[PDB]
Design a binder for this molecule. Structure first.
Ligand SMILES: CCCCCCCCCO[C@@H]1O[C@H](CO)[C@@H](O)[C@H](O)[C@H]1O
Ligand SMILES: CCCCCCCCCO[C@@H]1O[C@H](CO)[C@@H](O)[C@H](O)[C@H]1O
Ligand SMILES: CCCCCCCCCO[C@@H]1O[C@H](CO)[C@@H](O)[C@H](O)[C@H]1O
Ligand SMILES: O=C(O)CCCC[C@@H]1SC[C@@H]2NC(=O)N[C@@H]21
Length: 189
């Protein structure tokens, strides 16, 4: 049961995480040829949320970001948003983002990664849930909503892997540094 100081801290950090995800969206996306889904930076913030704030508050932070997009603020990459855009080609990735911080936070906590020097374990958890889970759900949704063969969608999504691996690596480096003091231990009890 948090103290007032802990709850003010949690509000501050959660608000920062939501704002950070939004700021990453100020970079324009890079269109690729073969599918109507760009390379972006914003999914990195989604990856970091669960490793900093754990499975509850990480999810709330991402949820708040997504809620802002759903009601119409242009907080997605390139100044996009609105509820209708969630039924579009990139909808699957976005829905997967809501679950990513829960999954990452849950396994970091359960495998005690946050209390160890096992940064490679952390990287694998981030890869599994922030990269593979996200890109797979995204690829399936894309196949259905753009009426393209599933095999084509899955293969085309390999284009995202190099950039997504870099994001996952930077995620582990950044979050482990932020955690080393003090300070985020509350979220992984
Ligand atoms: C710089 C571009 C605009 C940035 C907008 C930042 C929005 C920050 C909102 O975050 C949310 O605030 C809620 C209370 O307001 C918290 O309950 C919640 O945990 C947190 O996720
Ligand atoms: C905008 C939607 C916000 C949804 C809020 C997410 C609720 C977080 C649930 O807590 C988690 O429950 C798990 C099992 O129930 C525990 O294993 C874990 O330790 C705990 O952190
Ligand atoms: C002042 C700029 C930052 C916030 C200002 C309020 C903007 C609210 C509505 O914006 C609109 O959002 C749509 C998505 O819902 C976009 O499709 C559209 O291009 C954009 O015009
Ligand atoms: O703003 C949107 O509409 C969502 C775009 C989703 C892009 C996905 S996220 C995972 C993969 N890696 C990228 O760089 N882009 C795609």
């Amino acid at each position: 049961a948090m103290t007032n100081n802990q709850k003010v801290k949690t509000l501050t950090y959660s608000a920062f995480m939501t704002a950070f995800i939004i700021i990453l969206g100020f970079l324009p996306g890079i269109p690729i040829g073969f599918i109507p889904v760009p390379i972006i930076l914003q999914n990195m913030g989604i990856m970091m949320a669960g490793g900093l704030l754990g499975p509850k508050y990480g999810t709330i932070s991402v949820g708040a970001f997504l809620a802002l997009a759903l009601i119409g603020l242009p907080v997605l990459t390139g100044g996009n948003g609105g509820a209708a855009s969630f039924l579009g080609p990139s909808g699957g990735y976005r829905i997967a983002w809501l679950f990513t911080p829960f999954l990452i936070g849950f396994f970091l906590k359960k495998l005690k990664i946050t209390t160890s020097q096992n940064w490679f374990g952390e990287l694998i958890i981030v890869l599994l849930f922030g990269v593979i889970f996200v890109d797979f759900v995204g690829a399936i949704w894309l196949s259905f909503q753009s009426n393209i063969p599933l095999l084509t969608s899955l293969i085309s999504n390999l284009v995202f892997i190099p950039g997504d691996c870099i994001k996952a690596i930077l995620t582990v480096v950044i979050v482990r540094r932020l955690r080393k003091q003090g300070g985020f231990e509350l979220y992984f009890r």
